[PDB]
Write a protein that binds this ligand. Structure first.
Ligand code: HEM
Length: 391
């Protein structure tokens, strides 16, 4: 519908890309919009690196960014990703799903007196933030410190699609550095405290974990926790809020889901296909490559538009139709390959619980017609930042 998407997100307005691959001369980067091409790129990490900072004229020191396996390639990626995967022990997962319904009901008890409110600010954002905070074992008071950090990182994320001078890049890189130091000194004290009093959380698991036979340092622990927070917060808030927005918009699909509650998981996946919280990811070419019959030189920044790939009619029938029960749905919303979303199970468990409970407790919940949603002002994300609702 007449929704105010990021102007760069042409696929949300039902437009096909003119070329599967193009070059942005003003930003000095390459764009890929096709599904088979994107999928192949994500499955070829040896050629398409996730270490995009390699191409920056000004960089952070490697010791400072290590542990952020989202920007790490083989052979070192698997170790890092492995510890964290492992760290998500079967007890932890169980404990998380045991807590999510409690958190959700608690949130909605918070808006019980309100006939009108912002679903994102009141519900959809706090829930995944709270879940990850508890998983990391930080006190509730520290959830504040995280929402603070997440607007600085949301601020730095914004205007990434504007051209930047080498000096502006230095300025951004220095504010990023100050924030990494504050987090590093934070996680340093959570590590100490966890060593002093271990608990049933992820940090407790991390202080014992080892790479190359050595335990992790403050920078590794900090960069892993930061990556869980940043990757798992607003992505999940958007999936929850996009999903309620789409149900409101497509009353036929809404009716299907209310009538047949077994559709909710497939609804969430289709929500991801159709309005992809992460709608593009960055890659750097290690060598010269051909993509959709287009030659891309060595050392280039390539934006893989998973949001656009997800509307590719070569992969999906009627890709611009929202189908709550869509199957099969091998969308790229969660990535593909070695960097495939680590928190996928938690994100699906949370979102499912959230939608289900919104449907049961607030069956009259609707998008406020006097007050439309706004979309997140970040080019690699397709989702709502505000969703005023009325009961
Ligand atoms: C709707 C919810 C989510 C979406 C759409 C999403 C999306 C994605 C995507 C597209 C990637 C691939 C990145 C790339 O290839 O460059 C990814 C990876 C990742 N996700 Fe998620 N994510 C979500 C929720 C979560 C949650 C809840 C967590 C943690 C609690 C999380 C943690 C991570 C991590 C650590 C990675 C990096 C894995 C690696 O690089 O090996 N995400 N996610």
């Amino acid at each position: 519908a007449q929704w105010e998407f990021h102007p760069g997100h042409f696929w949300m307005r039902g437009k096909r890309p003119d070329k599967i691959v193009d070059y942005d001369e003003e930003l000095q980067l390459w764009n890929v919009y096709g599904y088979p091409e994107s999928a192949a790129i994500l499955s070829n990490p040896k050629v398409f690196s996730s270490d995009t900072m390699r191409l920056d004229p000004i960089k952070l020191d490697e010791a400072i960014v290590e542990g952020d396996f989202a920007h790490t390639d083989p052979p070192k990626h698997r170790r890092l990703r492995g510890l964290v995967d492992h760290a998500f022990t079967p007890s932890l997962v169980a404990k998380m799903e045991s807590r999510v319904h409690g958190i959700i009901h608690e949130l909605l008890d918070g808006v019980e007196g309100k006939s009108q409110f912002d679903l994102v600010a009141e519900f959809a954002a706090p829930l995944p933030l709270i879940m990850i905070s508890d998983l990391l074992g930080v006190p509730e008071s520290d959830r504040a410190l995280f929402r603070q950090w997440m607007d600085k990182m949301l601020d730095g994320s914004e205007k990434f699609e504007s051209p930047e001078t080498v000096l502006e890049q230095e300025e951004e890189l220095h504010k990023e550095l100050e924030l990494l130091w504050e987090m590093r000194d934070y996680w340093h004290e959570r590590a100490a405290e966890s060593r002093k009093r271990p608990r049933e959380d992820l940090i407790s698991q991390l202080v014992h974990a080892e790479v190359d036979g050595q335990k992790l340092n403050d920078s590794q622990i900090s960069n892993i926790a930061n990556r869980l927070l940043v990757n798992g917060h607003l992505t999940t808030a958007m999936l929850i809020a996009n999903t309620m927005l789409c149900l409101d918009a497509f009353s036929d699909q809404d009716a299907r889901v209310r009538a047949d509650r077994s559709l909710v998981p497939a609804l969430l996946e289709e929500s991801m296909r159709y309005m992809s919280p992460i709608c593009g990811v960055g890659r750097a070419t290690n060598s010269e490559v051909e993509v959709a019959g287009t030659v891309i030189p060595k050392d280039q920044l390539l934006l893989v538009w998973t949001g656009a790939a997800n509307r590719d009619e070569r992969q999906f029938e009627k890709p611009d139709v929202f189908d709550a029960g869509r199957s099969p749905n091998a969308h790229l919303g969660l990535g593909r390959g070695i960097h495939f979303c680590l928190g996928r199970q938690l994100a699906r468990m949370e979102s499912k619980a959230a939608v289900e409970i919104l449907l049961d407790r607030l069956p009259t919940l609707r998008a406020d017609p006097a007050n439309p949603p706004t979309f997140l002002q970040v080019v690699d994300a397709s989702g709502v930042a505000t969703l005023p609702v009325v009961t």
